[PDB]
């Protein structure tokens, strides 16, 4: 019921008239299940049971936005501290509103 | 000569793990003790010329390691008093656990894997030992983690051992995440990775606790102490290996080498493991959990001495490597126990005909735990306990600590040998060739001489105590030793039933962090970007 | 550096003459003898010119092509992975393809000149949108989204090089120039924004990776993503450090969130190739954080970064597409005792996943010292933040490894003589660069 | 067999929806005519129109966008009654 | 300090002199250079040759500065291993120039948003001198603890 | 199942494999099979003893030149006998041996 | 095909039948405990962050008294 | 290999390229109704 199609002395040829089922590298494919298929369909199409709720807002909101507002929050104070540390002026960041202009510390100068 | 003992247990390695088919299951039963025999040999003469006769030496392998702008560092091997002490104890337990797995490990697949496993996992820890600066000692402590990783999973089949794989290596991820933070630091402040430069006399508080994050996660400490039960899924040669020296000692190890810790966070973590611990041992019925329990007590016990005296970083490593031999013994011992019999169970143990060496192995080994006079780890920790008085919480901590550790031996030791016989009427054998006989041999030497060498220089220097405080010491533990014997009820069912749940540290990961971690995961990608950013 | 782009030139020349049945075998010698003019090109670059290795120009400011330190290093990768990717892949419309999308992404990191920049790297826009697009194999919805955001970036940086070139009067990079313009800078950093994927324009990767070929997954994980650090090294810090000076805390945040939630949306995965491709996602935030600090560490451990992700990921997506091959499946959840079914291909897929977590015997571990130490001399929390974080990735490659390991299977998927000789290449550059050879 | 998408509503009900768009469709020159001469003379009389903030002619151009209804959605809806 | 149109002119006609003078003669290291153009520019893209010329030899300084760490390190390594447990008496002054050489690597380039490296925690020192001296001339309390006089091995 | 005729070039079972196990005796591993004992084992573990003590003279050799003793030895030490850079001994008191 | 939904049953007898079920409703956590868990564990992470700012605002503090006692001191004299 | 030599050529050839262009974009109108702006262009007007 099954055949050797792989030939090592190179004299290979593909038997697709052969009684016997060729053992190629289809023999090993995993057999696969209905259920896990649909799984895998509804997980990767999730976005069709998206549903904007406040709840769902909340948790968007509650951890994406916050921990972006907590990284800025952190960097900002990051730079003042190196700022300080430096002995730089007040650096105008882009949202910070400064009536520095300082930006990039000149190599030259000593601080 | 220095070199010669890695060189080995790395080639042990390499030649059962990638030409065990040319050599075969016997093989690497000669291959990998011959190696680290030789090794032995090599350690022995590292300990006698760097300990004894003062003698240390630096091997730079090559330069520039890593070579980035000022960021330097090079392969370089430092082998000072506390590395000779460490890789001879290391050696030598490797060598006996080598020697036991020709006959235990005979009945499993893979056996010249498993060689490979533990002879490169030796090897990482005599290289994360004998680093002359961080960034070798970073090596070697990834090396015992992964190696760690593919040892307790062993069993690919049992969800349990993959999980514990998993347990452990998240877990030693965070610890080592602390750790690189504060190699980071130091090398910031101070110029260098090497330990040399890397004295400090005055560090930030924050360099200290992110030393101790990172310590407390190898060696088991409370709210890091959850891998080292689940490690028991790994067979018992990895479990000795792990246990005694490799994976829980680094974080004593690290904690020694760089003194930045701090007095008042390592005496209350410490102690507040060892009871902890002690209690956990109290509860369970697998015999490999007990002992595992235990050894995170004598964690504890060690964590808590550095806060004591200056002698307190001697005393801990004093103690390190005088309970590296015992519990691996013990650890032996139980996993002949439990393939003589078929079972992990205490109750359904008891009194057989046996070989005369593993229960005398087994009862001494259990008498130094207890602290039984006029042995080599009755000093280790009587140089604990007297010296933590000063600390009164610390010691009176450790005194109940001593009091628990007592009572699970004692009902062990009871359970295994004095007890009737338990289990059911089958033909169970385990018959124990000469090279068993030699593993435990090896660790008899070890814990004879460690009795005339000792353990630390102030070992026997006078602490100026009353006599009634010196030895209570003795008397609590005798204390326990009866109350075991005679296996009273000492707690109520509800703290009982408290303590084999461990404290619920697992479960409060399990309901609220996990979930947690997977509710962020759920928010940032099902709400997110396969929700609110994809198209229909 | 004549003989390495007149090799480049060479190769997608040689398809129009050859056989049609001797395609595969030529197009594999042209890929080994563009290497080698890669190495020579390596031989004649004198460290003794610190600021640039080689300048040829060819009559015109576009024709100036110039290798320098993150250029030389990304050109020798493309050169390195490039055969893998030719033997991977069968048919004579299939290599035109990848021969024409390696010529153009090979001459891009060379460029000089801004819009040539422009013009050699979009050049491989429907090559991708058909690519990733193909019959049966293929989604048109990755190559939509991979086509229209590469669309956006590159006419945002095309931009910002037409008003270069109006008020400097030239955009290329050899002559020194410097802007304060947010617009401009934000024209530029748009396209480094969207082509290293950083949140939120990072979901044209994933789709664009589990619907690309093998071949065509390792080159865009391989060097594709790179081509971002090219541009900003030669093309963004030089004109516009005013702007990541001035951005800074924005650009952290952007890129440690990226990391976070690239994390997080890694362990809600089911495929193989999703798993990796969004692993590279959260590796490009530090390259990216490194690099904007302008420091001496920063540009050095981010390119070293490069080098180790473009020797990892390769051989993560090289591993992922035999085992398809073998099994026709690529949802763990199916895929079960590989660790007996497959020794061989499971050593060398906890080698490399081992490589992906940044172990010490690894070039990643070399690199991410360098990154962090980088961001630790920008300050200490920055580097404590990344550090923590990284605990993400071991869960779930964890959590992968442990369903891949044991379990119950009847089929025997190893790999053949052809898979091993695919990926020996990248293990011994993994070792070489792992021991310190960087 | 594969798995698909779900379709939501009823077959005949959704075919019932689509048929509402087969409606008399009128030629598209009658606007166009409208659209050409109501343009020529309002691009005549923009010239003459004052000089407006870009804030506000941004916001005349959203509520434009707002308020543009396709042709389709008329001629789905139209009925002819009050 | 004003730079007028024509003397910036006249610096562009100069520095073509000098890069006709580099010219004539070849030279194996022109990209090593020894000294660097003097220059008084506002910025120095302004001049191309100038801008080039003087990074080339910033980065052969910072080569140096490497190099020179590396070889401090070692002695001071060596001093440490030699001594003993007099190591910390020997070797301060040592560890001192080797800490030194470090903090002027790094701090020469540290770049547009890095902090100033502080090995031996010699700016930390003194910012608590400072701190003290007020606190004790104005009579407040300090709640920072006072300058020590080893901090490291060195510094 | 009549054994495939590849079954002739495959090796037994070992007399270490327990007779219950069944194992499949195709797949390769480099670490070796379910239970190995090959012929000829004692020759390749002959040849691997060879290779580890030629590595561990090469060893000897590079470790002997980069072993370096800063410091005077306390008392006489066994790497005297092959290495001639240890410094020579000093006793407790400071003695030269 | 696919692979066979039927199950094997010869050793269920040895080891137990299949018949009981988990009672996992297998949903997450709730969004009302989840925000409490995630801004109670999230600063224990970031355990350093608030260590640098209550340094800082002390450092801040003190500088600024040490000025103003200073100013005073140098308005009299 | 003078490298030296090399990289003054290139970078002349870049500068001269840049030149060329500002030069070529200086365009006033070239409308024919723009006598003005153009008034010194040599032209002659058939019409
Ligand atoms: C962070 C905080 C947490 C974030 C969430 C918090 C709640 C969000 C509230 C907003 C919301 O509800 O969005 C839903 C809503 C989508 O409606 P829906 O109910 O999902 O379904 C309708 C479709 O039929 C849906 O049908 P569909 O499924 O076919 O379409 C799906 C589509 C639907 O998606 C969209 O339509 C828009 C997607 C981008 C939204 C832009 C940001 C909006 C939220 C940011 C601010 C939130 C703070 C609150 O998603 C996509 O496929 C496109 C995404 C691919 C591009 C990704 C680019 C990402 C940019 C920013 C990401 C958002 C931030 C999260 C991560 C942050 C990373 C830094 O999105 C919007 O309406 C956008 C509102 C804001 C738009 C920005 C302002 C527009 C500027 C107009 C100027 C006017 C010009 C005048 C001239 C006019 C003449 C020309
Ligand atoms: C009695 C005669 C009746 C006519 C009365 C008026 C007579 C004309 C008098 C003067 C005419 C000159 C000025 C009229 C506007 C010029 C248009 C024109 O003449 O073309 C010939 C056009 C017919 O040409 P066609 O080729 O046969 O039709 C092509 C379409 O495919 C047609 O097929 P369709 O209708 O089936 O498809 C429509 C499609 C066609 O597409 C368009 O309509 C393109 C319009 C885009 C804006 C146009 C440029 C705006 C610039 C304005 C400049 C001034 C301000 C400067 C600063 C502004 C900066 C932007 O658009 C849509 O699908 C619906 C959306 C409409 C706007 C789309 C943009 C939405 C942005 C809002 C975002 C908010 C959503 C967020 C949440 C989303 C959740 C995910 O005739 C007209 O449509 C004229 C109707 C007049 C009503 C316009 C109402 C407001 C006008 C000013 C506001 C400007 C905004 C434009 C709104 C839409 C105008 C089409
Ligand atoms: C430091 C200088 C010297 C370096 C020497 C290192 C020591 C040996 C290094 C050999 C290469 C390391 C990487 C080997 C491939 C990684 C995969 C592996 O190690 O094991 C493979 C397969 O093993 C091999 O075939 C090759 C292993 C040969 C020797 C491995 C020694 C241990 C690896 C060292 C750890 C690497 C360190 C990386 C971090 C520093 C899979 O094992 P399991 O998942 O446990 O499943 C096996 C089946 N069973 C369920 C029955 C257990
Ligand atoms: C399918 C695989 C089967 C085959 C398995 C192969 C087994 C491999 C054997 C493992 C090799 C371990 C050797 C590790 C040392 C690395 C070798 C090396 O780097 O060569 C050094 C020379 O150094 C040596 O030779 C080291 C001697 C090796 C033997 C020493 C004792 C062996 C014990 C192993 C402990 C090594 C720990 C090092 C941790 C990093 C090059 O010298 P440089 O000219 O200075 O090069 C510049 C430095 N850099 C590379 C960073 C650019
Ligand atoms: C619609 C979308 C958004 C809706 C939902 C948003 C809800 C989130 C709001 C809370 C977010 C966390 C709190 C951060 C913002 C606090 C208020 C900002 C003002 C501020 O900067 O104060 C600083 C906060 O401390 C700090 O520097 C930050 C401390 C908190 C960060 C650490 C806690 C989480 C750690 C997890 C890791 C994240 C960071 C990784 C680097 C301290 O004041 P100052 O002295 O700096 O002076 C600066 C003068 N205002
Ligand atoms: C003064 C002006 C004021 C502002 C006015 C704004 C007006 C709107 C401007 C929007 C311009 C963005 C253009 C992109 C549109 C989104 C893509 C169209 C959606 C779509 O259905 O495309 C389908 C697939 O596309 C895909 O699969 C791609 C998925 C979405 C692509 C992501 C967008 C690129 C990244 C966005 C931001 C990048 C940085 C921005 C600086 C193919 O449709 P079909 O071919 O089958 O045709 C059938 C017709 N239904
Ligand atoms: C909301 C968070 C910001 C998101 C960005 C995250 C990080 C991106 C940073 C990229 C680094 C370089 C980019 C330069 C600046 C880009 C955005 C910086 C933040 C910003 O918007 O600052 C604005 C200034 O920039 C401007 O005025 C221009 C903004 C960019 C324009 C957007 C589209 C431009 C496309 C142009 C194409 C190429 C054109 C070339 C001619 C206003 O800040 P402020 O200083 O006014 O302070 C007033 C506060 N009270």
């Given at each position: 019921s099954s055949r050797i199609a792989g030939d090592t002395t190179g004299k290979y040829t593909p038997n697709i008239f052969s009684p016997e089922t060729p053992m190629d590298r289809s023999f090993s494919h995993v057999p696969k299940n209905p259920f896990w298929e649909a799984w895998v369909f509804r997980r990767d199409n999730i976005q069709r049971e998206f549903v904007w709720t406040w709840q769902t807002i909340f948790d968007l909101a509650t951890f994406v936005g916050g921990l972006y507002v907590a990284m800025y929050a952190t960097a900002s104070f990051c730079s003042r501290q190196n700022d300080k540390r430096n002995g730089y002026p007040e650096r105008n960041y882009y949202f910070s509103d400064s009536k520095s202009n300082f930006v990039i510390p000149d190599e030259r100068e000593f601080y | 000569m220095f070199l010669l003992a890695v060189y080995f247990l790395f080639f042990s390695a390499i030649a059962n793990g990638f030409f065990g088919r040319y050599l075969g299951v016997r093989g690497s039963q000669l291959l990998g003790p011959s190696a680290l025999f030789l090794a032995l040999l090599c350690s022995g003469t590292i300990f006698y010329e760097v300990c004894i006769q003062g003698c240390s030496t630096n091997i730079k392998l090559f330069e520039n390691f890593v070579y980035s702008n000022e960021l330097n560092v090079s392969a370089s091997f430092l082998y000072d008093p506390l590395a000779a002490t460490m890789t001879l104890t290391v050696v030598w337990i490797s060598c006996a656990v080598h020697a036991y797995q020709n006959l235990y490990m005979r009945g499993d697949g893979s056996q010249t894997l498993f060689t490979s496993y533990l002879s490169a996992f030796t090897g990482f820890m005599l290289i994360l030992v004998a680093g002359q600066n961080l960034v070798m000692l970073f090596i070697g402590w990834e090396g015992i983690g992964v190696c760690s990783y593919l040892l307790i999973g062993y069993?690919?089949?049992?969800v349990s051992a993959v999980k514990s794989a998993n347990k452990s290596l998240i877990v030693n991820k965070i610890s080592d995440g602390f750790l690189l933070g504060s190699m980071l630091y130091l090398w910031f402040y101070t110029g260098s990775f090497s330990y040399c430069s890397l004295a400090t006399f005055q560090i930030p508080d924050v360099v200290s606790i992110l030393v101790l994050l990172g310590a407390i996660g190898k060696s088991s400490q409370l709210f890091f102490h959850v891998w080292l039960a689940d490690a028991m899924e790994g067979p018992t040669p990895v479990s000795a290996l792990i246990h005694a020296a490799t994976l829980v000692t680094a974080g004593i190890y690290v904690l020694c080498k760089l003194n930045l810790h701090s007095q008042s966070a390592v005496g209350i973590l410490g102690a507040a493991t060892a009871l902890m611990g002690g209690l956990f041992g109290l509860a369970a019925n697998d015999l490999k959990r007990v002992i595992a329990f235990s050894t995170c007590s004598q964690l504890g016990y060690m964590m808590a001495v550095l806060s004591t005296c200056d002698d307190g970083a001697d005393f801990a490593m004093g103690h390190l490597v005088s309970h590296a031999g015992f519990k691996a013994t013990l650890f032996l011992s139980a996993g002949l126990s439990i393939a003589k019999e078929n079972n992990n169970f205490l109750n359904r143990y008891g009194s057989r005909q046996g070989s005369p060496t593993l229960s005398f192995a087994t009862t001494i080994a259990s008498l130094n735990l207890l602290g039984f006079p006029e042995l080599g780890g009755f000093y280790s920790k009587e140089s604990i306990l007297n010296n933590a008085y000063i600390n009164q919480g610390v010691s009176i901590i450790l005194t109940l600590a001593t009091f628990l550790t007592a009572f699970y031996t004692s009902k062990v030791l009871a359970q295994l040998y004095l007890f009737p016989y338990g289990n059911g009427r089958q033909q169970k054998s385990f018959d124990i060739d000469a090279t068993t006989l030699i593993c435990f041999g090896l660790l008899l030497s070890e814990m004879l001489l460690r009795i005339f060498t000792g353990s630390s220089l102030s070992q026997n220097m006078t602490t100026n105590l009353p006599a009634h405080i010196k030895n209570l010491p003795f008397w609590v533990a005798l204390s326990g030793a009866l109350s075991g014997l005679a296996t009273?009820?000492?707690?109520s069912s509800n703290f009982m039933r408290f303590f084999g749940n461990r404290g619920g540290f697992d479960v409060f990961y399990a309901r609220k962090c996990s979930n947690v971690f997977y509710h962020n995961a759920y928010v940032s990608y099902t709400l997110l970007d396969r929700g609110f950013l994809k198209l229909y | 550096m004549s003989l390495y782009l007149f090799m480049l030139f060479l190769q997608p020349l040689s398809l129009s003459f050859v056989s049609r049945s001797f395609s595969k075998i030529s197009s594999l010698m042209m890929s080994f003898a563009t290497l080698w003019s890669a190495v020579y090109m390596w031989f004649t670059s004198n460290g003794a010119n610190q600021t640039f290795y080689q300048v040829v120009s060819w009559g015109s400011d576009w024709s100036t092509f110039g290798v320098c330190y993150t250029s030389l290093y990304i050109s020798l990768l493309c050169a390195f992975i490039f055969p893998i990717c030719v033997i991977l892949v069968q048919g004579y419309r299939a290599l035109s393809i990848l021969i024409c999308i390696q010529t153009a992404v090979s001459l891009s990191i060379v460029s000089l000149h801004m819009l040539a920049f422009y013009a050699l790297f979009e050049s491989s826009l429907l090559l991708f949108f058909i690519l990733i697009g193909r019959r049966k194999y293929g989604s048109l919805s990755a190559a939509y989204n991979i086509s229209i955001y590469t669309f956006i970036s590159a006419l945002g940086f095309l931009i910002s090089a037409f008003w270069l070139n109006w008020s400097f009067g030239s955009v290329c990079a050899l002559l020194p120039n410097e802007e304060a313009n947010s617009f401009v800078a934000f024209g530029i950093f748009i396209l480094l924004w969207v082509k290293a994927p950083l949140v939120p324009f990072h979901l044209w990767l994933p789709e664009a990776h589990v619907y690309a070929p093998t071949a065509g997954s390792v080159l865009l994980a391989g060097v594709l993503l790179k081509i971002s650090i090219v541009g900003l090294h030669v093309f963004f810090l030089p004109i516009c450090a005013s702007s990541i000076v001035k951005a800074f805390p924005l650009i952290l945040s952007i890129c440690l969130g990226s990391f976070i939630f690239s994390s997080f949306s890694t362990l809600k995965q089911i495929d193989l190739k999703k798993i990796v491709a969004y692993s590279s996602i959260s590796h490009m935030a530090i390259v990216f954080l490194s690099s904007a600090t302008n420091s001496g560490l920063g540009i050095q451990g981010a390119v070293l970064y490069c080098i180790a992700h473009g020797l990892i990921s390769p051989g993560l997506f090289l591993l992922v597409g035999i085992l398809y091959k073998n099994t026709n499946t690529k949802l763990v959840f199916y895929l079960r005792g590989l660790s007996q079914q497959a020794p061989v291909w499971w050593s060398v897929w906890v080698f490399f996943m081992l490589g992906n977590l940044a172990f010490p015997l690894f070039p990643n571990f070399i690199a991410e010292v360098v990154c962090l130490s980088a961001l630790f001399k920008n300050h200490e929390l920055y580097a404590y933040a990344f550090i923590f974080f990284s605990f993400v990735g071991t869960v779930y490659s964890s959590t992968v490894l442990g369903r891949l390991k044991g379990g119950v299977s009847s089929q025997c998927v190893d790999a053949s003589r052809l898979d091993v000789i695919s990926w020996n290449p990248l293990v011994l550059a993994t070792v070489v660069t792992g021991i310190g050879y960087m | 067999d594969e798995p698909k998408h779900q379709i939501p509503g009823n077959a005949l009900d959704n075919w019932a929806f689509l048929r509402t768009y087969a409606k008399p469709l009128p030629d598209m020159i009658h606007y166009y005519y409208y659209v050409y001469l109501f343009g020529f003379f309002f691009v005549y009389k923009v010239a003459d129109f004052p000089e407006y903030s870009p804030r506000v002619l941004v916001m005349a151009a959203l509520i434009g966008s707002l308020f543009y209804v396709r042709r389709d959605w008329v001629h789905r809806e139209f009925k002819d009654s009050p | 300090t004003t730079a007028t149109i024509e003397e910036r002119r006249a610096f562009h006609k100069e520095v073509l002199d000098i890069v006709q003078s580099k010219l004539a003669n070849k030279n194996s290291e022109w990209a090593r250079p020894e000294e660097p153009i003097l220059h008084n520019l506002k910025s120095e893209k302004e001049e191309p040759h100038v801008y080039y010329h003087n990074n080339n030899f910033r980065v052969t300084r910072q080569l140096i500065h490497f190099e020179k760490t590396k070889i401090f390190e070692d002695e001071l390594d060596k001093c440490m291993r030699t001594h003993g447990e007099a190591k910390y008496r020997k070797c301060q002054e040592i560890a001192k120039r080797f800490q030194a050489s470090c903090r002027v690597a790094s701090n020469?380039?540290?770049?547009?948003n890095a902090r100033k490296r502080d090995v031996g925690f010699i700016y930390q020192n003194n910012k608590l001198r400072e701190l003290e001296k007020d606190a004790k001339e104005l009579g407040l309390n300090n709640p920072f603890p006072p300058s020590s006089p080893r901090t490291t091995i060195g510094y | 199942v009549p054994e495939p005729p590849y079954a002739k070039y495959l090796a037994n079972k070992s007399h270490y494999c327990p007779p219950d196990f069944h194992y499949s005796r195709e797949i390769y591993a480099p670490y070796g099979g379910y239970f190995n004992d090959p012929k000829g084992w004692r020759t390749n573990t002959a040849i691997a003893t060879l290779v580890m003590l030629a590595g561990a003279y090469a060893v000897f050799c590079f470790g002997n030149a980069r072993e370096e003793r800063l410091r005077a030895p306390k008392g006489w030490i066994p790497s005297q006998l092959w290495n001639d850079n240890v410094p020579t001994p000093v006793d407790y008191r400071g003695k030269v041996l | 095909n696919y692979a066979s939904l039927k199950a094997d049953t010869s050793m269920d007898h040895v080891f137990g039948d299949s018949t009981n079920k988990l009672n996992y409703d297998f949903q997450l956590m709730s969004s009302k405990e989840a925000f409490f868990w995630n801004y109670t564990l999230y600063p224990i992470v970031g355990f350093p962050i608030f260590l640098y700012l209550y340094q800082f605002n002390k450092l801040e503090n003190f500088e600024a008294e040490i000025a103003a006692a200073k100013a005073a001191k140098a308005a009299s004299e | 290999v003078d490298s030296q030599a090399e990289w003054y050529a290139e970078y002349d050839k870049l500068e001269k390229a840049r030149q060329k262009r500002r030069i070529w974009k200086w365009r006033d109108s070239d409308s024919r109704d723009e006598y003005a702006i153009n008034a010194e262009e040599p032209v002659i007007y058939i019409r």
């Open positions: - | 069993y690919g089949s049992r009273t009820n000492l707690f | - | - | 020469l380039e540290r770049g547009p | - | - | -």
